[PDB]
Every structure is written in structure tokens, then in C-alpha cells.
Design an enzyme around this catalytic site. Structure first.
Site, PDB file in Angstrom:
ATOM      1  N   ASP A   6     -23.943 -31.241  22.089  1.00 41.33           N
ATOM      2  CA  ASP A   6     -23.637 -29.813  22.041  1.00 41.33           C
ATOM      3  C   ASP A   6     -22.800 -29.508  23.278  1.00 41.33           C
ATOM      4  O   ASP A   6     -23.338 -29.237  24.355  1.00 41.33           O
ATOM      5  CB  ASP A   6     -24.912 -28.979  21.989  1.00 41.33           C
ATOM      6  CG  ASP A   6     -24.638 -27.492  22.056  1.00 41.33           C
ATOM      7  OD1 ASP A   6     -24.200 -26.920  21.036  1.00 41.33           O
ATOM      8  OD2 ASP A   6     -24.866 -26.896  23.129  1.00 41.33           O
ATOM      9  N   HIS A  32     -25.714 -11.200  -1.942  1.00 40.63           N
ATOM     10  CA  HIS A  32     -24.626 -12.089  -1.566  1.00 40.63           C
ATOM     11  C   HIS A  32     -23.770 -12.377  -2.790  1.00 40.63           C
ATOM     12  O   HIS A  32     -24.288 -12.797  -3.830  1.00 40.63           O
ATOM     13  CB  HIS A  32     -25.173 -13.387  -0.976  1.00 40.63           C
ATOM     14  CG  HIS A  32     -25.847 -13.206   0.346  1.00 40.63           C
ATOM     15  ND1 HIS A  32     -26.561 -14.211   0.961  1.00 40.63           N
ATOM     16  CD2 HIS A  32     -25.930 -12.131   1.165  1.00 40.63           C
ATOM     17  CE1 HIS A  32     -27.048 -13.766   2.105  1.00 40.63           C
ATOM     18  NE2 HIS A  32     -26.680 -12.507   2.252  1.00 40.63           N
TER      19      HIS A  32
END
Length: 1026
Positions: free
Chosen positions: A8, A535
RNA sequence: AACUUGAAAAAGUGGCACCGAGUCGGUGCU
């Protein structure tokens, strides 16, 4: 055994973690060096690095330098020289007159079969290699990567992806016709801006178009900078100006500026190929010859002209070099000479084509003018290929070294310069270097065994509350523009405020014009709670939680019974309303298409492929670059052929995959609690990457770095959801690539589909996911309380500034008798005296007045040097007289999840109400966290005034709502946070910074020298020295 | 970061399983 790495990577941190075949993070016995009695330690193979941005030796080594520019240029020259000189081993007046430019020789060598002088062809090829251009386009040139039309389309798509709210849509635009036209840059910019109704040049896109054309935009008004930023593509300072600009504004816009650069390159390529008399020619050198011919013709014409109407000032124009003459222009610029000559052309009568050449910026131009280095290297390689075909018979050596010189021209550890020649803030380069050497240390820890998987993800920078108002500003602009376009006084009857628009429900309520999007009656303003969010593209097919795929309605049941996009029954009723919303620019064209997809057959196979592309492919260019760097450094083995064997596979994902994983499966993250969140994100990276890569082996070319066999979508998709699923080789009918983690999948109709408890690959019979054991494993890993956190120690180079503190034992004179007494002090070395300090420390300390200094234990203490004391408390050496907190509060995942849920209390209804009930039931977690932080503060912080003040504040503010309590506990965590103390605010009480002015304790503490991963520790007991 | 060899570019050093978990602890093996 078999393992992998997750990463990350950010501008301040590098998270890392290692998972095995069972998704567990190993723990190892690690040697501890130093002069203590502790010779071993148990450490978890998970951790993160921290590094504060600043000016350092590495930071300077990561800066672009004309020195390295020039040295690799001379290196290239030396290769070409050596070649041609070995060939040789095995006039000026004529050269100048019949070769007035090197471009003349270029073109005549391309198009001439006659024998040419060897030194001259050598000079031409030396020019080719020395000035080779950029490598921004990979592979051979073709219309696909050359056409101004699509490259403008790529620029606008990149912009839209970089925003995805308030976008610009350009489909009917004629980019080729507008940009390729032979006119002035300013007028071309005006014409292009005229065709896009939304913005102007002053805006970001207007300035990008101006830059691509060749003007000098300023980004001050666009990006709120207090310091002006001028960017010119022709200027040699463009690279470092862009680096500074991105340092000020953020690093996510590098792709935007690179797309603008590519558009400019396309413009230059289309203009240079515009004059193509012959197909088998060299358009670049030919147009350069034409430009020089225009230069010479206009020079002679002006010499003749200044004579007829006015012989005077002929010296001032041609010979003076006095103020701004043409000789001044040939002696040093373009706009200066234009400004000088504009009054002359205004006064002179009967002016003509000289003027159009002047304002079209193609008048009397030099050999190396502006916009000449932007040419891609493919032009040069094609030109050289033509040269070699022309001269193939005469010189056998060029036939022998065709591929040799081609590879010399095209070839691009040199890690520092490799990362320096990139597009980003001078912090992401440092972070990438940190990442590379972190991976190096990890693979050295694992006994030179290479991992199977390396997952890569660039950590998204959290909102700094400065961009939190920016998006609000654009959304207010959008809503006011749309409401003015329509004409319903919704804002007049119910005014709002930027802050209030961050509520998704209210924002959708206003985007749907205060009217239900499926049913024709007005929505209730003061009854928003009863409404639900639907959605357009169901999450079982596409994971998109943005405004583009969200609508608000009274009930989800109105969309119909089918699992696709809504049925035509409501479409027929609300087509007019949808069209009005489209024309109001409140709803984007992609949203409208996904709305009306049912009328065009419904969800299709190409759409499903595109959804896989959107959810799986990474477009950010620096991510591709870092993946390339890691893969090149990792895999260095080949076979008898020239193909690279991929024993280690580099994995790339987005931040949305891990974010949605956390949100779905309750692995919530709160970054300010401690620095463990970087390592946890890396762990989730590795887990998700390994699971996907073992579940879907035919999707390599989508996200994995490498040159694989490209695949199609027909073999990926089953014909039917139930009649074909679990009965064929097709991997997935559902385009939400995240499915195989879920044990139960909700559809658009409500049927909760079940999938086997254990996940295996059909082709190889390799089990990949046991939904109970692996979930418990991930929970345990995230709850593991020992995670390696390291703050980088760096020397400061470049109110004096101390380079680093030095720890010394010596003698001092005390009292009138000048009796020598043992002394132990913290001495700071300023930058100016540092060179003399390394030159002669003994003499330097003698001059400062210390006596009997032992050269052995003169200890260099960089900034942030970690010190451990009684009860394991840690402090970092901030300066010669200040200290910083050095400990981490390892809070259990139960309180971590409680804090996340309580902080995000307001932000499916069933799981929402279950989470609300879970938050409401566990009220005592507040007091438990208070006790935890209090005991941790008594253990490591030792600021009794701060502890008792904050405890009194919490006791006073016990009965306040849990959401505010949790947010203020989040703020309170500043007391225990790593690094320098900072003031933090509770409900009403501010707790000031408790500076560690006393620094004598570290003189008897334990110093620990941490590695970049924190696994190799050197703990030194300072008290034994004396 | 630290340690060692070198004027310098640059090269080298930190055993393995299990049971656990308050910044890692314990057991078997070597």
C-alpha cells in the site's frame, strides 16, 4: 513455503504484509543485536514504514539534473562514435553552403541513393541518437496511437475518469479539424473552447488545451495556489515546474498532464506529416527543409523590401543586434522578436503572407525551435531504417548492426534516475524507493526465496478538508445550473448549503428535481428517512457506489421483477422527465445510457466485459511504472528463446476493491488510531490478489503486469445464470469480480443466492477460499497487536539548521578550580560545521571545549532516533533539546470496528439497522477505550496534566451522543499518536502540546536502530557507556 | 537505520515448525 506480498504505497507510508497459502501472516524469531541481555524477539511479518517529506541526500538524488541528462547524452554519442570509428578503422565552406541545416542532410540521406560522405552520414546519425525524442508511446507508430481524434478522446476520457463528477462529454466535436487547422494558437484555443459549452480557457481544461497548443497557461486561479505556476511545453523547465505543481496540488493529476502532453504530440505529428509529398519519405526532415526554405525566402524578400519603401532601419533589422532586431532574434526570443516587428509590419504598406506566417508562428524559424523535441522516437527509428535500407549495400557493418543500433536507440541499478524521470511530486519518488528496498529486505528475510504474488496499490490520500469544500462547490454549481435550466424554484422553496449537500440522499433528491424518478408524484421533504437508495447497475454485476450509479426512490420494488436495468413500463412514462434531466446537464450521458439500457436489449456481453475492465484494470501510469520496476528487478531469468519466464507475478489492483472488501466483510479501518492501517491494507491487498489470481487464471492480461496471451470475453461468460453455471468452463456470469468471497449474493429481485462454502478452481482443482476458516484467519491477522511501525531517520542537508545530533562522552571544566568532571550531553551539529565535523571530529570537539573525547563511542543520532525506556515507553529524538512520542497503542479489532461504526453511524436497510443496533448495544466500549487509552498514556506518555485534564473532560461529557463521543475519542487519539505532540480539541476543552523539552533521560535510555521493515533491531543500552 | 571490508563506484550479516497473544510470549527441533 509458498507466500506473497501486499503493498500500500503512498507519499508518507509503505505498507507491507506476507501471507501464506492459507492466508496467514507468519511469525518468526528475529535476532536482536546490541549490548543487552535480550538476544531474540518474536515479530510478526507485517508492518509499515513512515517518512516525512523534506530535503535530504536521497531527495536531491531523486531530482532531475541536467548533469545526468548530458552524461547519458554523451554516452549515447560515445556508443555511436565507437561503432562508426571501428568501421572506419576496419570542405567546411561547401558543407555549410550545401548543408545549411542538419535536416537537409537528413532528408537527402533518406531520399538519396548516391554515396554520401561518411563523416556527414555519421553526423546525421549522431544527431539522430543525441536528439531522439520521448518514449511516451510504446511500440511502432500506427493510427491507433497517432490520430489526433482518438488521442483527444483519450484526453477527455482521462479527465472524466479523474473527476467522474461534473464531467465533460465530447463526441460530436471535430478535434482533428479544429486542432489540425493551420492558424494561430490563441485563435485555435478560442475555437476549441467555443465548441465545448461547459468551460473556458481560464479553467483546467482550457489551460490544458492551451498548453497542448503551445501557450503559457497559469494554474493559480484553477487550483487556488498562493504562488503562480507557469507551464510551457517548449521550455526546458517544464519537467521541474510540473513536479512542483504536482507537489502543491496532489499526484493524481499526472495522468491528466501526460494526456495533455500526448495531445500536443499528436498535434505536432499531424502538422509535421501534413506536408507529405511522398509516402516513402521522411516527413519530419522534409517539413524542416520546407520551414528553412520559407526562412530563406522571407529573409531575401525582407532584404529586398527594406529598400523600396524605406531603406532606413535596415541596419536596425539585419545588422545592428542593438535592441530587438532580427539579428537579435537569431542571437537570442520568438515573442520578443514578434513584439519588436509588429509596429514595423503595421506601418509598412501592402503587408501580406509574411503576416500570416508571423501570426501562425511559422515565420523565419531557426533549426532548433520550440516544439521540436516533442517528436516521438518512432519517427527517428523509421528514418534510420530508411537510411540503412538506402546504404545497405555499401557498408556491411550497418547491415550487421541493424538491430544493435536499433536497440541502442530504443533502450531506456539506475533506480534513482529511473524514478526521477517520471511524473509526480518529489515525495512519491521517495516512497517508491522505500517500497523497492522494503521488498528487497523482505525477500532477504525469507531466505532469498521469491514470492508467488506481489499486490500493488497506491494509497489514496485522505481528504484534507480543503478538497471537502471543493466538491461541494462543484455540486452547488451543477445543481444551480440545472435548476436554472429547468425553471422549478426548488431551491427558492427549500434553500440548502454546501455542507448539507454531502448527504447522498439529499444530493440525489436535488438531482432528481424533488420528484420521484419512477413514480409521478412529489416527494416529501421532511420524510427522507423512509426512502431507499437503488443502484441502476446492481452490485452483483458492477460495484459502483458513486453518484453515476445511484438513484433515489420510495421503493425498490418499482424497478420491476427482472434482475436487469429497469423495465420499459416506467421508461415509457418517464422518458420525457429523463430527457429533461439529460438536457439540464444534471445527469451524465453514461448514467442515461445505463438507465435506458433495457430499451437497447438490456445488459449485454460487451457491457459485462467493460464492467470487468472497469473493476479490474488500472489506468494510472505511475502504477504501471512501479509495477514495471518491481517486475524487472524481480524476474531476471530467461530461456533459450527471447521470452521472459514469469516465476514471480506482479499484481495490480485499485483502492476500491480493498475498500469494498472492508465495507462488505466488516474489516473496517480507522487510520488515525495507529499506523497499523497501512500494514492492514497491504495484508488485504495480498489476500485479495492471491485469491483472485488463483480463482481466475485466464484474466492475466487484464490486471497482471507482463506480456501474456490476450483473451476475450466469450470464454469468460456463461450463457445462462442457472442453466449454464456450475456446468461449463465459463468462470462467471456475474461481472462483479468480487463474488467468490461472498457466501450469499443478493440480486436485484431479492433472491439471496448461495454459493459453496469452499471455493476451488475448476480447471486445476485447487481450493482457493474456505469462507469460514479464511475469514477467521483475516480477523485474527487484523487483530494481531504487534505490527512493525518505523519512522525513517534522515540527515538534514541544505536560526541555524542542525544536520544531526551527536552523542558524546567527554570532560568539562567546572567551577573556579576548573576540575574535570564526567559529562554526558546532547550536542547538535549545524549544516555549516558538518563538513569540518566529518573532516576532524576530535579537533572539532576540542575546539568546542570538550576534553578527553573517546573516538570510539561518538554516536551519530539522526532525526527521529527511537529511544526505549522503562515500561517500554518510546521517544524519538526530534532535536538537540526536544523529543517526540514513539509508541503505538494496539487497540483490539473489536474497539476498532466499534469506533468505525460509531463515527460513521449516519453514513441495505436490514444490515444498516443491525449495525445501528450493534452500536447502540455496546455503550460500555466507550469507557473501555477510555480506560485503555488512560493506561497506555500512564505507561508511555507521562503527561499527568494532559491525562487528568482529558479524563475530567470525558467525565464531564459522558452523557453526550455516542457518535460525537466516538468522533472526539478519534480526535483524542492525538495524545497517544506517534511523532511530535500536537494540540487536540475535545467537545469544548483544548489540550495544549506537551513539549518534551527535557532531554537528559535519553542519555540513560535504550537506543534502537530500526531497519526499514522494523524486523532487524539494534538495541543499544546507553547507560553502560561512560 | 546499524555492523564489517574498501580512496571511491560498490559488495556482505539476522535458522525451522507448533501452541498461543498487550507492542509478542511459550514448546519441539537445529
Amino acid at each position: 513455503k509458498k507466500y506473497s506480498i501486499g503493498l500500500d504505497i503512498g507519499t508518507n507510508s509503505v505498507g507491507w504484509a506476507v501471507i501464506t497459502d492459507e492466508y496467514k501472516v507468519p511469525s518468526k524469531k528475529f535476532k536482536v543485536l546490541g549490548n543487552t541481555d535480550r538476544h531474540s524477539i518474536k515479530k510478526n511479518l507485517i508492518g509499515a514504514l513512515l517518512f516525512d517529506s523534506g530535503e535530504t541526500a536521497e531527495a536531491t538524488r531523486l531530482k532531475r539534473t541536467a548533469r545526468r541528462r548530458y552524461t547519458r547524452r554523451k554516452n549515447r554519442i560515445c556508443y555511436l562514435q565507437e561503432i562508426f570509428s571501428n568501421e572506419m578503422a576496419k570542405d567546411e565552406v561547401a558543407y555549410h553552403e550545401k548543408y545549411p541545416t542538419i535536416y537537409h542532410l537528413r532528408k537527402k540521406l533518406v531520399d538519396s541513393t548516391d554515396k554520401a560522405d561518411l563523416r556527414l552520414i555519421y553526423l546525421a546519425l549522431a544527431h539522430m541518437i543525441k536528439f531522439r525524442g520521448h518514449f511516451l508511446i510504446e511500440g511502432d507508430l500506427n493510427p491507433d496511437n497517432s490520430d489526433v481524434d482518438k488521442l483527444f478522446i483519450q484526453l477527455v476520457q482521462t479527465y472524466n475518469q479523474l473527476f467522474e463528477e461534473n464531467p465533460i462529454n465530447a463526441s460530436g466535436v471535430d478535434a482533428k479539424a479544429i486542432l489540425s487547422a493551420r492558424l494561430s494558437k490563441s485563435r485555435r484555443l478560442e475555437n476549441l473552447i467555443a465548441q465545448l459549452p461547459g468551460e473556458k480557457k481560464n479553467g483546467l481544461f482550457g489551460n490544458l488545451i492551451a498548453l497542448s497548443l503551445g501557450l503559457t497557461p497559469n494554474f493559480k486561479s484553477n487550483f487556488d495556489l498562493a504562488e503562480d505556476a507557469k507551464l510551457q511545453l517548449s521550455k526546458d523547465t517544464y519537467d521541474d515546474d510540473l513536479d512542483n505543481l504536482l507537489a502543491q496540488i496532489g499526484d493524481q493529476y499526472a495522468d491528466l498532464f501526460l494526456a495533455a502532453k500526448n495531445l500536443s504530440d499528436a498535434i505536432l505529428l499531424s502538422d509535421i506529416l501534413r506536408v507529405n509529398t511522398e509516402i516513402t519519405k521522411a516527413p519530419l526532415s522534409a517539413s524542416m527543409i520546407k520551414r528553412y526554405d520559407e526562412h530563406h525566402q522571407d529573409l531575401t524578400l525582407l532584404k529586398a523590401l527594406v529598400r523600396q519603401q524605406l531603406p532606413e532601419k535596415y541596419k536596425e533589422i539585419f545588422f545592428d543586434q542593438s535592441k530587438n532586431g532580427y539579428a537579435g532574434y537569431i542571437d537570442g526570443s520568438q515573442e520578443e522578436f514578434y513584439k519588436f516587428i509588429k509596429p514595423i509590419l503595421e506601418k509598412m504598406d501592402g503587408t501580406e503572407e509574411l503576416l500570416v506566417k508571423l501570426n501562425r508562428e511559422d515565420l523565419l524559424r531557426k533549426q532548433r525551435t520550440f516544439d521540436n523535441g516533442s517528436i516521438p522516437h518512432q519517427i527517428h527509428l523509421g528514418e534510420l531504417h530508411a537510411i540503412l535500407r538506402r546504404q545497405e549495400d555499401f557498408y556491411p557493418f550497418l547491415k550487421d548492426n541493424r538491430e544493435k543500433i536499433e536497440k541502442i536507440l530504443t533502450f531506456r541499478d539506475s533506480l534513482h534516475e529511473h524514478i526521477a524521470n517520471l511524473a509526480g511530486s518529489p515525495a512519491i519518488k521517495k516512497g517508491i524507493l522505500q517500497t523497492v528496498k522494503v521488498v528487497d529486505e523482505l525477500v532477504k528475510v525469507m531466505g532469498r526465496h521469491k514470492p508467488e504474488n506481489i499486490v500493488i496499490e497506491m494509497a489514496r490520500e485522505n481528504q484534507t478538508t480543503q478538497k471537502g469544500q471543493k466538491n461541494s462547490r462543484e455540486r452547488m454549481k451543477r445543481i444551480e445550473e440545472g435548476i436554472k435550466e429547468l425553471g422549478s424554484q426548488i431551491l427558492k422553496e427549500h434553500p440548502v448549503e454546501n455542507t448539507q449537500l454531502q448527504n447522498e440522499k439529499l444530493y440525489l433528491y436535488y438531482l432528481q428535481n424533488g420528484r420521484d424518478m419512477y413514480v409521478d408524484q412529489e416527494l416529501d421533504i421532511n420524510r427522507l428517512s423512509d426512502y431507499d437508495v437503488d443502484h441502476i447497475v446492481p452490485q452483483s454485476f458492477l460495484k459502483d457506489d458513486s453518484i453515476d450509479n445511484k438513484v433515489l426512490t420510495r421503493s425498490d420494488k418499482n424497478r420491476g421483477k427482472s434482475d436487469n436495468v429497469p423495465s420499459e413500463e416506467v421508461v415509457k412514462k418517464m422518458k420525457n422527465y429523463w430527457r429533461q434531466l439529460l438536457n439540464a446537464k444534471l445527469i451524465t450521458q453514461r448514467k442515461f445510457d445505463n438507465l435506458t439500457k433495457a430499451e437497447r436489449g438490456g445488459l449485454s456481453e460487451l457491457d459485462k466485459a467493460g464492467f470487468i475492465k472497469r473493476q479490474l484494470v488500472e489506468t494510472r501510469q505511475i502504477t504501471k511504472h512501479v509495477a514495471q520496476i518491481l517486475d524487472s528487478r524481480m524476474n531476471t531469468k530467461y530461456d533459450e528463446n527471447d521470452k521472459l519466464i514469469r516465476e514471480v507475478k506482479v499484481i495490480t489492483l485499485k483502492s476500491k476493491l480493498v475498500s469494498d472488501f472492508r465495507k462488505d466483510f466488516q474489516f473496517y479501518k480507522v487510520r488515525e488510531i495507529n499506523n497499523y492501517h497501512h500494514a492492514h491494507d497491504a495484508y488485504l491487498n495480498a489476500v485479495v490478489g492471491t485469491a483472485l489470481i488463483k480463482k481466475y487464471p485466464k484474466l492475466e492480461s487484464e490486471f497482471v503486469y507482463g506480456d501474456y496471451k490476450v483473451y476475450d470475453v466469450r470464454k469468460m461468460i456463461a450463457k445462462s445464470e442457472q442453466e449454464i453455471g456450475k456446468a461449463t468452463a465459463k468462470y462467471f456470469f456475474y461481472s462483479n469480480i468480487m463474488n467468490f468471497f461472498k457466501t450469499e449474493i443478493t440480486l436485484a429481485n431479492g433472491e439471496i443466492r448461495k454459493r459453496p462454502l469452499i471455493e476451488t478452481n475448476g480447471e486445476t482443482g485447487e481450493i482457493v477460499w474456505d469462507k469460514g476458516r479464511d475469514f477467521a484467519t483475516v480477523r485474527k491477522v487484523l487483530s494481531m497487536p504487534q505490527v512493525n511501525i518505523v519512522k525513517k531517520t534522515e540527515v538534514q542537508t541544505g536560526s541555524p539548521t542542525v544536520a544531526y545530533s551527536v552523542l558524546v562522552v567527554a570532560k568539562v571544566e567546572k567551577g573556579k578550580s576548573k576540575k574535570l568532571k564526567s559529562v554526558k550531553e546532547l550536542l547538535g551539529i549545524t549544516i555549516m560545521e558538518r563538513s569540518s565535523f566529518e573532516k576532524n571530529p576530535i579537533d572539532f570537539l576540542e575546539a568546542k571545549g570538550y576534553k578527553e573525547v573517546k573516538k570510539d563511542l561518538i554516536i551519530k543520532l539522526p532525526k527521529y532516533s527511537l529511544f526505549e525506556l522503562e515500561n517500554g515507553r518510546k521517544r524519538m529524538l526530534a532535536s538537540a533539546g526536544e523529543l517526540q512520542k514513539g509508541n503505538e497503542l494496539a487497540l483490539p479489532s473489536k474497539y476498532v470496528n466499534f469506533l468505525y461504526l460509531a463515527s460513521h453511524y449516519e453514513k441495505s436497510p436490514e444490515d444498516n439497522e443491525q449495525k445501528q443496533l450493534f452500536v447502540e448495544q455496546h455503550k460500555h466500549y466507550l469507557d473501555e477505550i477510555i480506560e485503555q487509552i488512560s493506561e497506555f498514556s500512564k505507561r508511555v506518555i507521562l503527561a499527568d496534566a494532559n491525562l487528568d485534564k482529558v479524563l475530567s473532560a470525558y467525565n464531564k461529557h459522558r452523557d453526550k451522543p455516542i457518535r460525537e463521543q466516538a468522533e472526539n475519542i478519534i480526535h483524542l487519539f492525538t495524545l497517544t499518536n506517534l511523532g511530535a505532540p500536537a494540540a487536540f480539541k475535545y467537545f469544548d476543552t483544548t489540550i495544549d502540546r506537551k513539549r518534551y523539552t527535557s532531554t537528559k533521560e535519553v542519555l540513560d535510555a535504550t537506543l534502537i536502530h530500526q531497519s526499514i521493515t522494523g524486523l532487524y533491531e539494534t538495541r543499544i543500552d546507553l547507560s553502560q557507556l561512560g
